[PDB]
Design a protein around this ligand. Structure first.
Ligand SMILES: OC[C@H]1O[C@@H]2O[C@H]3[C@H](O)[C@@H](O)[C@@H](O[C@H]4[C@H](O)[C@@H](O)[C@@H](O[C@H]5[C@H](O)[C@@H](O)[C@@H](O[C@H]6[C@H](O)[C@@H](O)[C@@H](O[C@H]7[C@H](O)[C@@H](O)[C@@H](O[C@H]8[C@H](O)[C@@H](O)[C@@H](O[C@H]1[C@H](O)[C@H]2O)O[C@@H]8CO)O[C@@H]7CO)O[C@@H]6CO)O[C@@H]5CO)O[C@@H]4CO)O[C@@H]3CO
Ligand SMILES: OC[C@H]1O[C@@H]2O[C@H]3[C@H](O)[C@@H](O)[C@@H](O[C@H]4[C@H](O)[C@@H](O)[C@@H](O[C@H]5[C@H](O)[C@@H](O)[C@@H](O[C@H]6[C@H](O)[C@@H](O)[C@@H](O[C@H]7[C@H](O)[C@@H](O)[C@@H](O[C@H]8[C@H](O)[C@@H](O)[C@@H](O[C@H]1[C@H](O)[C@H]2O)O[C@@H]8CO)O[C@@H]7CO)O[C@@H]6CO)O[C@@H]5CO)O[C@@H]4CO)O[C@@H]3CO
Ligand SMILES: OC[C@H]1O[C@H](O[C@H]2[C@H](O)[C@@H](O)[C@@H](O)O[C@@H]2CO)[C@H](O)[C@@H](O)[C@@H]1O
Ligand SMILES: OC[C@H]1O[C@H](O[C@H]2[C@H](O)[C@@H](O)[C@@H](O)O[C@@H]2CO)[C@H](O)[C@@H](O)[C@@H]1O
Lengths: 649, 649
């Protein structure tokens, strides 16, 4: 038996790990299946994609086309339906009608064999008719057969009868396919909408307290939720909610020794009060947390908990499972590191003495929180734990609960970042914060929206508690506005960390990405009410961006994205589409100076002719413009960060 | 079981068809096995390649290195031995000694935990010692252990004792490997030297006749063999040696109707006198052919027969197996085509009515010629027959006779070209004749010597009976000289078609690649003796090029090739290496004007320092030069096509 079939169909994509892991989609998402298809000799081929759902049922007739002439690379778009494990096959075949037509069109005007050629077409059409289930369509092809065979009529006329539009449409729907050959099936995992699409908000409950009790509880912090819903967020990502160690606790601003009142770092998980299955006593009880989760649910908010597989020196695991830590010869456990960053307040887990026990406990913890309505976990620094460990944990949890979503906070090298997505992380943090120029943004999003999109779903946090980028530091409010726009329109998932709205941009010191007086080491109460009344918050912009997203399907996908040239380096332009919805964005990346540019749109890339002029509405302002091949824009920092335009029907 | 192992080893290369077809080498050839290797956390990894022979025996310790820092891509060179099917695996592991050393070097000068750090190194060294089979090497590591543990000695001193050269050499040969993890084996087919390396000469026996009997026989044509051997060729490729049809026979210059004495085209195979298992009666008998083959063998020449799976209208198959042809409704068979080229004199084969009978007969024909000492077949236009058909045929023949070599004359699109090589064709014709500028040559050879080298072995014919390129037409003798130099130094297999030596360059007409009075349609006697005495032949250059090839192992491989920059567009420079043999070639691609240029050698790419000045000998002239980073060359067309230099040792 041969590896290549009768009609070669090779190198089907997407493929992940050579077919050993599935390619990804979410319900209702479209993507391109491609293949290399050709045959021996000079006759034409065709191809189509057969997409199978979890019960094995084939989808609709999905014909492919050659993506560029003479390349033998064929493609077609497919669309994922319900969640679960699907499979896709590419079928290739000889296309004898297209071949016959080609020759007929030359030979009949040339008087060469006109009877023999026409009879050959007659027979092709007969075979095509036999496979057609429609009675009307069958009658139509057979009327062509009779015409082709009518030796009473001129050659040119008999041929024309076989090339009518209504003959084409029947053959387009039901082609004569010779020597049908299939690739081996490739696996596709289809997950829920939120894996790809969602707007995220991170805050620390303990900061949302009162005058009498500064350390916030779940009951007091629930009061922030309506404001977060009103900004159009879907997911609230909480830092670790557990007790916090006292041994080597850090103080304010990442000092080494905490003083009497210091609250410490939430990631230094565990004390005698409990571990990863417990609630910090100062946030309240498990019932309080259920209340917080219920109230979020009513506002259309899901909770994502932080999961940081690591311990403070006072976590019960230290004494109950010493073999989950690596001990030096004197018995001590070296504190974790991400050099030059030191984490004196925590111990990293060692996985090679009792991998099974770690696995079993890890999934039990996750299942505990799942039973309390947390169906999303933001996994802290996964790349310092074994890759195969996450592969096993995720498979175990998604085996019973396939709706659970894992976000990988892996700020590290590409190989590892890719691998973690491929072994099952539904979402990944990305290099976004370090893509600020037009070159950087264009290259990186070309990468994310291209081949990487078959295994990685990006979550664009414009800031995190650990990343306050120089661009926001030096750019002030207008920089916060630009990054919001970019994040929210370039990725169908994005997020901000509370304080972003208020344009908090004071670093620990020049050349650092840490915040001064970081919320990681202290309570950080904020006058939300004052900011709203004094208008020193960008919440209204954020709110508007999420509404636009909710209103335009094109922004709820990733893969369809195109960059349109401008004559200014500071000005970037791009479009995204989904069905008839098209969104066109132009952003001035200069946060200090007004930029005027000419934006030269790739009209065909919008599905318009070059001369055409399409009306647009800038959804940020409600203003309308008539735009075409070449468009003057003028963008003043502080007044306008960007145009975010929809193309009107 | 997880898809990723404890220490990730991913995307092992080379790979062909995702592991479904083997990668290729020949006996004694070197190539790079690579893989993506990394781990969690910040500790170091190592990796090594385990290469297995047909009996399953592992080869030598072959450590890999990271090919560029921070990339996580690792590689090592391996060398194929005896012929047959091999396998390669990549092992990845934690490298705890490299990790410990790194920290020790910082901490000990810092006075930070010196005792604990040194004791940790002691224990690592002890474990490494336990796996070392040599008693002396074991004593050496244990002496380091004792030194590391001597608390009476200064920290800096105890550490130094563990980092001596003689400790490094023991650990380099027998590292401590944690958590060893392997890839799945990948297949490698190792074939004989000639599949990769050989010089080819094509001629038509029928042209080497006499005054009394113009149509040459095998007995008269055997007289050409010594001259061919003298030119340093290894393989004589004959056009089809079978009877030739009379129905629709072509005349001189590809005219449609042959006249009385016209000999017709050898590819129009078959008459009542016999088919593909027969000898044209005018060439003599099978015994005469055995004589020709025997005499070739004694001169160090292997025969390669043309195999064209096609028939003249008078081939016996036409009536004996009509279902091997596609018939139109009136019973006729359309003559073969490769538009705008027409082959009115032949019928193409149809494969779908009796694929089994075609397979059986085809391999019987091949076996017939094999039993008469032909162990090489040049397969005519394989891309007009099914790919899976060649896959089945070749597997069948190589199953019993793995030494037989197939060369694919597939001048067609890349996908088909690649695929035919991948499904088992040992050699491929290439786009060479249409790569004449420095950009063209550089790009194309970068491609052939790169990833394509794991499945395709190129045969650079500078001309064929069907391709006389415009460059030779317009360039005259000096162009023939350049192309000979390029072909013979750029690919370890090359060839010419008789007449090339005499610089035959008259086209059928302006803008054609056909020869005037082509030998395909007529006897073409040549005054070899006169050319030799009048010196109007480039046989001496050809002879010299093959000798240089035979004397320099670098020219007998493909994959090691590097292009060195010059300040002149007409002047190209490149080097090839194999062990200590280095050949450096500089060619003036202008055939009409002298070119002077400065050749700036990538010295490290030669394995020399930038300031170094190495002696070379131009093997064309015997002249010696001292060359370094920058070198003036002056190349006059007719006098010197190129410098073909060896680096002296
Ligand atoms: O009619 C379309 C075509 O017309 C014009 O081309 C003329 C050309 O300008 C002249 O210079 C001449 O071309 C000869 C050429 O210079 C010689 O070098 C030789 O060409 C060989 C190639 O050098 C060699 O590589 C190989 O070529 C293969 C390609 O490498 C490979 O990519 C593939 O080619 C496919 C193309 O990649 C793909 O785009 C598609 O081709 C389209 C062209 O790209 C598109 O621009 C257009 O091309 C024009 C051309 O630009 C004009 O100058 O038409 C195509 C639309 O379908 O498909 C290609 C496959 O068909 O495969 C090829 C080989 O199959 O092989 C060739 C020779 O083996 O020979 C040339 C002629 O003797 O003449 C032509 C017109 O006759
Ligand atoms: O190593 C010596 C090195 O020293 C100097 O680096 C300084 C640099 O110029 C400053 O700009 C700054 O660096 C910060 C950077 O500019 C910030 O934007 C941010 O960078 C983030 C990246 O933007 C983001 O992409 C991600 O980085 C990943 C890369 O994208 C990814 O490709 C890969 O990186 C590997 C490289 O591809 C690989 O080539 C190899 O890198 C070496 C360089 O090639 C080599 O030239 C040299 O560079 C100098 C440099 O010229 C000086 O400026 O060293 C490199 C290490 O050998 O190895 C890379 C693997 O490490 O992976 C990374 C993720 O690791 O994330 C980063 C940050 O999260 O932050 C930067 C931190 O300051 O300061 C540095 C001084 O440290
Ligand atoms: O208590 C541990 C540690 O936490 C911090 O850094 C976190 C960070 O918040 C995470 O999101 C990610 O970057 O990994 C780290 C570990 O979970 C503090 O910055 C650090 O100073 C503190 O010691
Ligand atoms: O006489 C049949 C046919 O053969 C020729 O072309 C060959 C060519 O020599 C091969 O190198 C390859 O391209 O396939 C062809 C068919 O076997 C003649 O050049 C052609 O005119 C002739 O009709």
């Amino acid at each position: 038996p041969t590896v290549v079939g009768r009609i070669p169909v090779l190198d089907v994509r997407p493929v992940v790990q050579r077919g050993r892991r599935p390619a990804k989609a979410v319900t209702g998402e479209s993507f391109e299946v491609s293949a290399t298809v050709f045959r021996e000799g000079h006759d034409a081929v065709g191809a189509n994609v057969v997409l199978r759902d979890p019960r094995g049922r084939p989808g609709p007739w999905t014909p492919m086309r050659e993506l560029a002439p003479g390349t033998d690379r064929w493609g077609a778009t497919v669309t994922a339906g319900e969640t679960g494990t699907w499979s896709y096959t590419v079928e290739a075949w000889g296309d004898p009608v297209t071949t016959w037509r080609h020759h007929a069109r030359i030979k009949i005007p040339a008087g060469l064999d006109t009877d023999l050629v026409l009879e050959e077409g007659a027979r092709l059409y007969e075979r095509a008719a036999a496979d057609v289930p429609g009675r009307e369509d069958r009658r139509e092809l057979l009327a062509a057969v009779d015409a082709l065979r009518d030796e009473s009529r001129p050659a040119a006329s008999r041929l024309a009868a076989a090339l009518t539009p209504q003959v084409d449409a029947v053959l387009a729907r039901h082609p004569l396919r010779d020597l049908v050959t299939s690739s081996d099936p490739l696996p596709l995992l289809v997950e829920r909408e939120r894996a790809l699409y969602g707007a995220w908000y991170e805050f620390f409950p303990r900061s949302e307290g009162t005058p009498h009790t500064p350390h916030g509880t779940f009951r007091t912090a629930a009061r922030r939720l309506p404001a977060i819903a009103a900004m159009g967020f879907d997911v609230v990502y909480l830092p670790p909610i557990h007790p916090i160690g006292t041994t080597h606790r850090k103080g304010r601003n990442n000092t080494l020794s905490a003083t009497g009142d210091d609250v410490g770092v939430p990631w230094a998980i565990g004390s005698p009060e409990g571990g990863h299955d417990s609630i910090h006593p100062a946030l309240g009880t498990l019932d309080d947390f259920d209340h917080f989760v219920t109230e979020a649910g009513k506002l259309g908010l899901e909770i994502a908990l932080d999961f940081a597989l690591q311990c403070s020196p006072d976590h019960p695991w230290v004494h109950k499972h010493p073999e989950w830590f690596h001990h030096r010869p004197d018995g001590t456990i070296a504190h974790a590191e991400n050099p030059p960053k030191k984490y004196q307040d925590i111990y990293p887990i060692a996985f090679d003495a009792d991998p099974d026990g770690l696995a079993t406990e890890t999934v039990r913890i996750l299942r505990h929180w799942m039973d309390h309505g947390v169906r999303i976990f933001r996994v802290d620094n996964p790349h310092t734990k074994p890759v195969a460990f996450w592969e096993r944990v995720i498979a175990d949890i998604n085996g019973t609960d396939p709706d659970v979503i894992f976000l990988a906070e892996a700020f590290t090298r590409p190989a590892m970042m890719a691998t973690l997505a491929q072994i099952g992380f539904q979402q990944s943090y990305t290099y976004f914060t370090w893509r600020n120029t037009k070159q950087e943004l264009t290259e990186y999003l070309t990468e994310l929206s291209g081949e990487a999109a078959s295994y990685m779903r990006p979550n664009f946090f414009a800031n995190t508690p650990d990343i306050l980028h120089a661009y926001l530091q030096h750019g002030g409010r207008p920089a916060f506005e630009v990054r919001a726009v970019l994040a929210a329109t370039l990725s169908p998932t994005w997020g901000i960390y509370s304080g972003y709205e208020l344009c908090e941009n004071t670093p620990l010191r020049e050349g650092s990405e840490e915040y001064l007086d970081s919320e990681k080491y202290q309570l950080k109460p904020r006058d939300w009410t004052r900011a709203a009344r004094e208008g020193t918050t960008i919440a209204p912009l954020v709110t508007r961006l999420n509404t636009i997203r909710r209103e335009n399907p094109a922004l709820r996908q990733l893969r369809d994205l195109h960059f349109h040239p401008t004559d200014k380096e500071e000005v970037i332009a791009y479009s995204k589409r989904q069905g008839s919805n098209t969104v066109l964005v132009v952003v001035n990346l200069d946060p200090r100076h007004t930029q005027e540019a000419t934006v030269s749109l790739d009209m065909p890339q919008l599905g318009l002719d070059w001369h055409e002029s399409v009306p647009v509405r800038d959804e940020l302002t409600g203003e309308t413009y008539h735009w075409g091949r070449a468009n003057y824009v003028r963008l003043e920092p502080g007044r306008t960060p960007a145009h975010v335009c929809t193309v009107l029907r």
